[PDB]
Design a protein around this ligand. Sequence first.
Ligand code: HEM
Ligand code: HEM
Ligand SMILES: NC(=O)C(c1ccccc1)(c1ccccc1)[C@@H]1CCN(CCc2ccc3c(c2)CCO3)C1
Ligand SMILES: NC(=O)C(c1ccccc1)(c1ccccc1)[C@@H]1CCN(CCc2ccc3c(c2)CCO3)C1
Lengths: 453, 453
Amino acid sequence: GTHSHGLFKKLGIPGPTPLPFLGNILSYHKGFCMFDMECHKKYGKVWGFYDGQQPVLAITDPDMIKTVLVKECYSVFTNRRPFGPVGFMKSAISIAEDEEWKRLRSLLSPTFTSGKLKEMVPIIAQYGDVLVRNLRREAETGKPVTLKDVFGAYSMDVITSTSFGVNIDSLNNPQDPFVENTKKLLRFFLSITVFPFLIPILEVLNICVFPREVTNFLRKSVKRMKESRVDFLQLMIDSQNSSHKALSDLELVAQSIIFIFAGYETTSSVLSFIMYELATHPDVQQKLQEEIDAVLPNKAPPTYDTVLQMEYLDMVVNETLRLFPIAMRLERVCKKDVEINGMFIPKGVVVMIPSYALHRDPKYWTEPEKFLPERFSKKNKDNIDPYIYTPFGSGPRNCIGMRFALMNMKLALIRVLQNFSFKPCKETQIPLKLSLGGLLQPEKPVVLKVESR
Amino acid sequence: GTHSHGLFKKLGIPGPTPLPFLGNILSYHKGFCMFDMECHKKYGKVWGFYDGQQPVLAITDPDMIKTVLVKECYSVFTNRRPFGPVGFMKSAISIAEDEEWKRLRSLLSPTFTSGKLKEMVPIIAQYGDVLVRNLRREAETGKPVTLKDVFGAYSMDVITSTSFGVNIDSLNNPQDPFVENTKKLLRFFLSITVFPFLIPILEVLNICVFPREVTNFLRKSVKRMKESRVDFLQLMIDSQNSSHKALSDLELVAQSIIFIFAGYETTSSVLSFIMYELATHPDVQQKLQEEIDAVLPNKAPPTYDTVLQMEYLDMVVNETLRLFPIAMRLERVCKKDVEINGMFIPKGVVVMIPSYALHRDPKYWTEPEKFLPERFSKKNKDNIDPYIYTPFGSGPRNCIGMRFALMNMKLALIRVLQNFSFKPCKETQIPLKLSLGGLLQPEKPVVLKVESR
Ligand code: HEM
Ligand code: HEM
Ligand SMILES: NC(=O)C(c1ccccc1)(c1ccccc1)[C@@H]1CCN(CCc2ccc3c(c2)CCO3)C1
Ligand SMILES: NC(=O)C(c1ccccc1)(c1ccccc1)[C@@H]1CCN(CCc2ccc3c(c2)CCO3)C1
């Protein structure tokens, strides 16, 4: 089981010696992030390891990262590593490959523009009101608040409503049909990465890592609203009634599902990360709350243009994403033999960009382990390399919902800080530790005290 | 197990209704050829069926065949369907895909030219002398001759000698090390086509459909002759010491092995097919023997330029290949969604050209089941469509050893007909029947009487 296990030794590329069949997966016992920082420290700018028999080439040179993510995206590095068994979710944009992804990116792009986001803000604002009343409830109880529930309820509230046009107080309504389905769906893989040779077997088995009932539920659910108002689902329906063939009925369901996966636990974790940093830095929480009340006096409701007016809110969000890039890694499959910036890359290799390691690299960040929003001040922001700081990826296949995610979090933070201050309690994990999973998340959930202003 | 089994029903393309998981493979019980002729008769110009869950789209329009084989070869239809587990034989030109095949086709092309073939004829001639003395031995015994042994011994003689630079009277020397290895190698697949989802499993199993000892044998065997004369092996070594990277040591072994597979049973079967047609048509055998003795009086030895002088020999060979195209089918994988000659072809579909069916189509061939070499006379040959008659494929990925194969067979036929006449005996399968396997071969071996002129 050492096929390809001599690839990096042949290329002269350093890296940890793999074991037969397993590759270097045993080193993942301390997590992706610790493994990336160690390899970066041990082997320098480039190194290779094996997910089972799959060679993975890590790169850290920003010139080389730009070549992979931007310049050679369409011709060489178009796709992420295969993920399955997907079934009909093969039509999702994040799973699609080559021309099929290229077409999906074109049809969905006008839906994620600045203009469309401003027309969705009044919807996001309503769920912000739900977040505040769900928070002040647990605030009544002096007993501390585990944020992942009230924030996860908010994160799922917005993302499924926008993606499917429904309305739910998901916390106070565990009964709505569009809730229980989305709940078991968002509960989420191993040997599919270590042993990806089984995926074709798993596919023909009719196996779907997505539950079979939820997918059949959402399909008939979207067909319900065909018989008919500014949401992801609605903006995609308008794209059908328009070059590329329009989004099919099944493709449309695939995109709405993939938006919930890319948006639920991602937003919920960053919101818990942000509030942990604001609780352990009262001055930053004070300076932020003072900015919100200046832009929005008398607890004025937030709007699209006022959110972009809050520079310190943008600095706090960006600095949290540097410390906690929940994707941890960016990956591209080398579709054909190429040489970039004076280095040969063999066809089939997975090229990985260790975002977590690069975000905490002392060579680019003074005291990289400290939460310091002034790194993103208008003075100091010009020194940050866009290919070192990559919380939303980069190039033509970056996070297409990036603008929305930032708006959605900022809108939640404004509505929460306008009403509450946040302090740590005796059970808050200080220092916070990271869980060893496929998304960067706090090891133990963030528990904080929530006082009412 | 009906994924993709609704593809042709959706496209409106006719074809036999598949069974779950199996597809249409049960219809293969009477062979590829009978199944292709029936579908052609039943459904007309185009139809689709399923090798398991693999959609196969059959086309018969010569304009559309030209588009697939020639015009859209490099951009859409570059590859045959996957074949494995191959191991290091992935570097063989017939197995290689996309740019890797494109490079191999360039490096090997100058080796299969008209000029190089003329320099190999003196080597092929020697094994022709071995064929005659091996034939006159069984001719001494009035007992009939099973041709597949004396011809198979000749076919393996030439193809392995040219591909590896050795010399063997393989019939009279079952002791030479380069014989027993080539023998067990040439003895040769099922669910790899019906259930190709297992190939990745079989690969990581370290399974090699090629025996593990023979491959390790030939590698050290080629390295023996590195320490050093007009053969395939020698012409490839000269290509290394020369744009594309040169043939590696392992790639060179892969090509020499793939030449033996493409050349042994193919040549041996056509030679048995040809001699069956000459035995059951004494006038054609007479007219051919009269041509050989006019071009080559006094049983003169054949040369390169005299072989191309024998038009009737070329007509007999070509007419045998129409009746018996041992590949039976040409196949290309549609690498991306395309429309050709007003018909949509989905990505991933296997496009198949039913050569056997087209060669016996009454719409192009008057009495297509009769052996009639005059179809290829200088008068009548202009009416034959090169995309209907495709015994060696067509386009940039056709049989690269085509010129050699025709020369090798013609040289054997000249040397055999100069000495012997061939008549059927009471055990000759008349009418000959075809075996139901992956290569077109006589059901029962051809047994004939061999008189000495
Ligand atoms: C804090 C929130 C989020 C973070 C940190 C995040 C991060 C990322 C990252 C790193 C990628 C891969 C980029 C690359 O490989 O270059 C990605 C892809 C993607 N994200 Fe986000 N994401 C967030 C929220 C969202 C939301 C709310 C949506 C809503 C639609 C979304 C939709 C997508 C999609 C569709 C892709 C795949 C794009 C493609 O393959 O073309 N994400 N995300
Ligand atoms: C009567 C003898 C032969 C017949 C009928 C025959 C037939 C064929 C056919 C139909 C193909 C596929 C063409 C296509 O898909 O368009 C092929 C491919 C090939 N043949 Fe032959 N063949 C014969 C002898 C030989 C010999 C003696 C060699 C010696 C090297 C050879 C080497 C090859 C190779 C390397 C390929 C693969 C070409 C590629 O994939 O680029 N063949 N053959
Ligand atoms: N299509 C894909 O490969 C996925 C994807 C990966 C990175 C960015 C976007 C999308 C995906 C599959 C299915 C559902 C959601 C996401 C991969 C396949 C396995 N990995 C597991 C979980 C995951 C990892 C990173 C991450 C996200 C999810 C969202 C943004 O980053 C997600
Ligand atoms: N590379 C390939 O796909 C092969 C190939 C197929 C058609 C033309 C050329 C090559 C091959 C694989 C391994 C060894 C020899 C040939 C295929 C894979 C399975 N099929 C089985 C036997 C076979 C079928 C048709 C035929 C030949 C061999 C030689 C010319 O036609 C051969």
